[PDB]
């Protein structure tokens, strides 16, 4: 029983780590968007 539960708890940690990675991916996509916007501003500054 203990061994079974040990694996259950292990799995729960894996889910947390999965979710952390998911959040990281989402933050990064948001950062890529931000940078792309900044890039357009830089292009406009060159235009200026």
């Amino acid at each position: 029983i203990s061994q079974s539960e040990t694996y259950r708890r292990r799995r729960q940690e894996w889910e947390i780590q999965r979710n952390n990675a998911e959040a990281e991916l989402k933050q990064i996509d948001a950062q890529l968007k931000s940078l792309a916007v900044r890039r357009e501003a830089a292009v406009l500054q060159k235009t200026s």
């Binding site: 948001a30 931000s34 916007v37 406009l44 235009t47 200026s48």
Partner: protein, 48 residues
Amino acid sequence: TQFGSTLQNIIERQDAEALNALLQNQAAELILTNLSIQDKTIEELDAE
């Protein structure tokens, strides 16, 4: 010679005013560009 002197002064003024018109028109053009840049900056913050 009095007319000649007068004419030179008129000429200098004619050209000076043309320059002021040019400079103000140029300032207006740059402002429109700067407005696009600041607007883009706000969009960037929304991405953040």
